[PDB]
Design a protein around this ligand. Structure first.
Ligand SMILES: Cc1cc(-c2cc(C(F)(F)F)ccc2O[C@H]2C[C@@]2(CN)c2ccc(F)cc2F)[nH]n1
Ligand SMILES: Cc1cc(-c2cc(C(F)(F)F)ccc2O[C@H]2C[C@@]2(CN)c2ccc(F)cc2F)[nH]n1
Length: 290
C-alpha cells in the first residue's frame, strides 16, 4: 500500500500482545466481523475482529484496512492504535468513539415533543464541517473513500464539544461483492453507470451525507428504491431540501450533485462554503423540525 509518498508494510504496524487486550462489551457489526469496546494495558479502545471462519481473500482484506487506516494522520479520521494479528481471531485496534455512529446519533437525538431542545443548526454544521475537513485531507492525499455516508461516521462524545470523524474504509479497501450491495443512493451517475471514481465522486457522496445530516438521520430518496434512484438521478432528478433546511446549505448539496464531475466543487471550496454557513445568523438561528 502507498500513501503520502511512502509504501507501508505489515511490520510497520504496531503488534499489540494478545495478552494485553481485554474485550469489554459488544458494539455492533462491521462489513464482515464484529466490533467491541476494549482495554489495553489503561487505554480505552475499539476492537474490530476478523471471523476465524473466513476466506484467504478475507484475511488480506482485513490487513489492508489496518494498513490504510494506519497511514492517515488527521483529527477527523479515526486513529489506528495497533493490531493483534499474531493471535486468532485477528484484531484491529482503533480509536473509541463514545458518541457512536452518526446516523444513530441523529435519529436518537431528533428533537421531540418530550425533549425538543436537544440539537441546533450550528451543531449540524460542525459535524458537516468535521467530515468535510477529513474528506479534504483525503482529497489532498489523493485517497478516494468512495463510501462517504452517515453510517460510516462516528462521534467522540454525544454532548457538546463532539467531533465527527470518518470511521470505516471497507469500500476503499475492497476496490483496491455485487450490485444489490452497492451504495447506489450515495453515488454519482458516472460511478454506477461506468464505475469511474475520483475526488468528485466523494464530493457527490458528501452532498448526500449533508442531506442525511439536515434530515436528521433519514434515508436518502426515502420512498424510492435503488433502481428508481438510478433512473431518477441519471434523468437529472435530485432530492428536495430536508425539513427546514436553510437555503445556503441546500445550495451546497445541489452543487455537490452537479451532473458533470468537473462542475462539482472540491473539498476546499465545500469547507469554505460550510464555514460561511456557520457565519450567517439566519442559518444558525433556524429551528429544527420536530
Ligand atoms: C472504530 C470504532 C467504532 C466505534 C464505536 C463506538 C461506540 C461507542 F459509542 F459505544 F463507544 C459505538 C459504536 C461504534 O462503532 C460501531 C457502530 C459501528 C459498527 N457498524 C461503526 C459505525 C461507524 C463506523 F465508522 C465504524 C463502526 F465500527 N468506535 N470506534
Ligand atoms: C466547479 C464548482 C465550484 C463550485 C462551487 C460550490 C460552492 C458551494 F458553496 F456550493 F459549495 C461555492 C463556490 C463554488 O465555485 C465558486 C468558487 C468558484 C468561483 N471562483 C469556482 C472556483 C473554481 C471553479 F472551477 C468553478 C467555480 F465556480 N461548484 N462547482
Amino acid at each position: 500500500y502507498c500513501f503520502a509518498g511512502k509504501t507501508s508494510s505489515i511490520s510497520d504496524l504496531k503488534e499489540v500482545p494478545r495478552k494485553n487486550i481485554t474485550l469489554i462489551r459488544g458494539l455492533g457489526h462491521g462489513a464482515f466481523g464484529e466490533v467491541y469496546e476494549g482495554q489495553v494495558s489503561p487505554l480505552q479502545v475499539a476492537v474490530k475482529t476478523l471471523p476465524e471462519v473466513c476466506s484467504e481473500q478475507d484475511e488480506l482484506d482485513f490487513l489492508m484496512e489496518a494498513l490504510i487506516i494506519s497511514k492517515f494522520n488527521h483529527q477527523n479520521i479515526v486513529r489506528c492504535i495497533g493490531v493483534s494479528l499474531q493471535s486468532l481471531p485477528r484484531f484491529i485496534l482503533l480509536e473509541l468513539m463514545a458518541g457512536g455512529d452518526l446516523k444513530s446519533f441523529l435519529r436518537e437525538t431528533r428533537p421531540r415533543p418530550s425533549q425538543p431542545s436537544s440539537l441546533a443548526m450550528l451543531d449540524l454544521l460542525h459535524v458537516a464541517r468535521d467530515i468535510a475537513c477529513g474528506c479534504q485531507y483525503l482529497e489532498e492525499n489523493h485517497f478516494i473513500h468512495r463510501d462517504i455516508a452517515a453510517r460510516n461516521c462516528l462521534l467522540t462524545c454525544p454532548g457538546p464539544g463532539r467531533v465527527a470523524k470518518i470511521g470505516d474504509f471497507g469500500m476503499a479497501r475492497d476496490i483496491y461483492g455485487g450490485c444489490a450491495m452497492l451504495p447506489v443512493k450515495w453515488m454519482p451517475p458516472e460511478a454506477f453507470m461506468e464505475g469511474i471514481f475520483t475526488s468528485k465522486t466523494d464530493t457527490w457522496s458528501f452532498g448526500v451525507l449533508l442531506w442525511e445530516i439536515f434530515s436528521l438521520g433519514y434515508m436518502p430518496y426515502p420512498s424510492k428504491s435503488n433502481q428508481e434512484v438510478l433512473e431518477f438521478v441519471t434523468s437529472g432528478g435530485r432530492m428536495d431540501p430536508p425539513k427546514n433546511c436553510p437555503g445556503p446549505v441546500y445550495r451546497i448539496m445541489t452543487q455537490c450533485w452537479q451532473h458533470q464531475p468537473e462542475d462539482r466543487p472540491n473539498f476546499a471550496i465545500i469547507l469554505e462554503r460550510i464555514e460561511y454557513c456557520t457565519q450567517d445568523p439566519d442559518v444558525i438561528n433556524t429551528a429544527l423540525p420536530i
